[PDB]
């Protein structure tokens, strides 16, 4: 059931489900709002900005935690994430889901 101390094996590419947000929180697509929120908190302080060196990796982490926190439990951010994800997701975050239509058609 996933023992702490996990190391990425050679089969890293197949171990990854292809989904990003879910896995930043250490959960799969089988999580519910409850799992997503708590995993946010648990990681949010762990990767809290002050815990970060010059490498923005941990900032990228906090970003994806804080992002997934909304995305997976949000019907829309999850919607376009599965639909297209590349543009619609990023733009809904920066511009706003209803707003994106400005950058879209």
Curated annotation (Swiss-Prot):
The keyword Chaperone applies. Residues 18-87 form the J domain. It comes from the Eukaryota. The modification N6-acetyllysine is found at residue 61. It is found in: Cytoplasm, Cytosol; Membrane; Cytoplasmic vesicle, Secretory vesicle, Chromaffin granule membrane; Melanosome. Ser-15 phosphorylation induces an order-to-disorder transition triggering the interaction with Lys-63. This conformational switch modulates DNAJC5's cellular functions by reducing binding to syntaxin and synaptogamin without altering HSC70 interactions. The modification Phosphotyrosine is found at residue 22. Expressed in pancreas, kidney, skeletal muscle, liver, lung, placenta, brain and heart. It is a lipid-anchor. Keywords: Acetylation, Cell membrane, Chaperone, Cytoplasm, Cytoplasmic vesicle, Disease variant, Lipoprotein, Membrane, Neurodegeneration, Neuronal ceroid lipofuscinosis, Palmitate, Phosphoprotein. The modification Phosphoserine is found at residues 13, 15, 17, 20. GO terms for cellular component: azurophil granule membrane; chromaffin granule membrane; clathrin-sculpted gamma-aminobutyric acid transport vesicle membrane; cytosol; intracellular membrane-bounded organelle; lysosomal membrane; melanosome; membrane. Disulfide bonds: none annotated. One of its GO terms (molecular function) is ATP-dependent protein binding. The keyword Chaperone applies. One of its GO terms (biological process) is regulated exocytosis. Acts as a general chaperone in regulated exocytosis. Acts as a co-chaperone for the SNARE protein SNAP-25. Involved in the calcium-mediated control of a late stage of exocytosis. May have an important role in presynaptic function. May be involved in calcium-dependent neurotransmitter release at nerve endings. It is linked to Ceroid lipofuscinosis, neuronal, 4B (Kufs type), autosomal dominant: An adult-onset neuronal ceroid lipofuscinosis. Neuronal ceroid lipofuscinoses are progressive neurodegenerative, lysosomal storage diseases characterized by intracellular accumulation of autofluorescent liposomal material, and clinically by seizures, dementia, visual loss, and/or cerebral atrophy. CLN4B has no visual involvement and is characterized by seizures and other neurologic symptoms. Oligomers. Homodimer. Interacts with the chaperone complex consisting of HSC70 and SGTA. Interacts with ZDHHC13 (via ANK repeats). Interacts with ZDHHC17 (via ANK repeats). Interacts with SYT1, SYT5 and SYT7, and with SYT9, forming a complex with SNAP25. Upon phosphorylation, Ser-15 interacts with Lys-63, a highly conserved residue in DnaJ proteins that is also a ubiquitination site in DNAJC5. This is DnaJ homolog subfamily C member 5. It comes from Homo sapiens (Human). The lineage of its organism: Eukaryota, Metazoa, Chordata, Craniata, Vertebrata. The gene is DNAJC5. The chain holds residues 1 to 100 of 198 of the full protein.
